[PDB]
Amino acid sequence: XPRPGGGGNGDFEEIPEEYL
């Protein structure tokens, strides 16, 4: 769901916040 960093400019797939 929520993209890493909030999304917007840089719509990436959901990446574990726990990792890096």
Side-chain angles (χ1 to χ4, degrees):
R3 294 75 164 133
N9 298 95
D11 186 88
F12 295 109
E13 304 176 296
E14 51 286 283
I15 296 180
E17 321 78 75
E18 309 172 290
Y19 155 80
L20 185 63

